[PDB]
């Protein structure tokens, strides 16, 4: 069904705004409203109110951090067509959204934003891999040591921590939660 | 059966309050009462009085029964109820609530969604904690010389403290603040 | 058969009191008497007189864990409430006069707390054992000046103290404070 | 469909310019427009508008290597020259007005240079990885006074910097200097 890009002034009037986690500073950067669906793109997630009837709505929430964006596509309108179509996959779920060709200028900005998000996520997955591999190379290099001047239990504690910090630091660095700056950059 | 979000002032009047562990500081943050069921969300657990007039009492502490797949469904023009769904442990819960009180059920949705996420992230951290302990065991395998029996005691203790401490940190028991953040 | 929660002052008048180990400071915290059975919950065990012969059973908590603690209320037409649990692997369902619900709900809370402590203890045992092994691995083949035979003795004592100490800590025998907390 | 090499001053008038990431300093170095398609070669990617709908494709060089760059001149009777290449695995053949041969030959040279740099980089990656391993092997099991946990951290950073650094060096993103060298 064909959708309308909503202006920022009318975000608070949208059904989707009730499900935005304003409490956690979640902010709406792009909203497309159709007769049957509402697609809300925030700094943290895609909030989607799915109408599977020609009036009840199923609420979905896909935080980017747990549901990566991939295969971002765009399709323009011909002379005879009334809509432009934007596509992507979030987690593994396929999204195809038809939008009033009048608002192409705006949908093209979303296309750019999503494309940039997908890439940052992709690159992050590559860095996680190196992060883990580096952890192993240390384990292998440092295997089989001597006591010398060593407090064994303290050293055992501290070593467990270093490993933890590295696995953790990298997990949160390369699975970033917030992509507001990406919408900020292209939605201007 | 269609339920009513109960007001805080009427929590001590509810059948579920008798099964809340007031002795351990358990506090009710959300209660939905229907003609057949009673669903009590405390800081520590879901307490469910289930009718199929007898009531079967279930208790699902969050620490041992993780919340997953938190869903919400709104009311159409013709419908009288909004539905909140989730899985606690493996059990599927679907609770119909008076559409009039949507403002409150949406807050529960947000709370549950936040708990589920915290628990998910904690599971991943446990994996890191365990994997890290192995990496030290490997790096420190086969040594030199040291007071062997004192070292043996102390080293066993570190391992224990590490395993235990992480177990309790990432399987947190209390989620009161999550309800407090979205309800109040 | 529908039972009656007995009052503390009438404990010494029950058939079950003859089988409580007063000599070891065993104290009755809850007794349900029916026309056929007698269920006696002490700090150390469930003593059950099963029936006009009676077969005596004793299930010390330390050797028979309590699990799957449930509760079931009465309907308008029912005269009883039912408390259920498994002790060791044995299934118990005990019908009690709905008039005494306030008391049976307390037993429910206590047994629930007992069961959880036992479960958590079984996890701690696992960490305790796993830690022992991690020191064995780290301390594997060493070197260094040392009184080998004394160190061998002392080392064997440490391992014994660890294994033993944790065995007694996480298979605790006495749960009197649990009953005390919820029956009080 | 026979295309036209567009002049730099008319780049901002092409449909493709709307999809260039000016915000990240992406600059168009070569644009061929046909009645159905639009091929836009930037420092970072091939942007292709495929056709009155147009499907937008973007193939950043860093994720889609250019290979098998070919060229085909016009015969007396032909109106076009054809430039071919594979990007990722996708086959591209682009017919262009034989009048503009002088320009398409420059694109040919640039794409040829891009493709070679990418190939050579894939060999360097292989050496970079193989070298990492040779240090792991040489540095396998050591001894010596040492702050084990700091050394473990620092060591893990080095490996990360090596893996990362080489990843970015040999999968370079920007090939603007290549176009600049042959279109100038």
Numbering used by the authors:
A (entry chain A): 14 to 67, 70 to 203
B (entry chain C): 14 to 65, 70 to 162, 165 to 203
C (entry chain B), D (entry chain B): 14 to 64, 70 to 161, 163 to 203
The authors write:
These structures share a common domain that is surprisingly similar to the eukaryotic PH-like domains, thus providing the first direct evidence for the existence of PH-like domains in prokaryotes. PHb1 and PHb2 share a common domain that is structurally similar to eukaryotic PH domains, which we have defined as a PHb domain (PH domain in bacteria).
PHb2 contains the PHb domain at its N-terminus (residue 14–136) and a helical-hairpin structure (∼ 68 residues) at the C-terminus that extends out and returns as two α-helices (α1, α2) to the PHb domain. A short helix at the C-terminus (α3) docks between α1 and the β2–β3 (L23) loop and, as a result, links the other end of the hairpin to the PHb domain. PHb2 is also a dome-shaped assembly, but with C12 cyclic symmetry that is generated by crystallographic C4 axis and a non-crystallographic C3 axis. The PHb2 dodecamer buries a total surface area of 46,700 Å2 or ∼ 50% of total surface area (3890 Å2 per monomer). The hairpin constitutes the primary mediator of the central core of the dodecameric PHb2 ring, mainly through hydrophobic interactions. The packing of hairpins involves the docking of surface hydrophobic residues of α1 (around Ile156) and α2 (Val167, Phe171, and Phe179) into a hydrophobic pocket formed by the adjacent hairpin of the neighboring protomer. On the other hand, the six independent protomers in the asu of PHb2 have similar packing environment and are essentially identical with each other in structure with an average rmsd of 0.27 Å for 180 aligned Cα atoms.
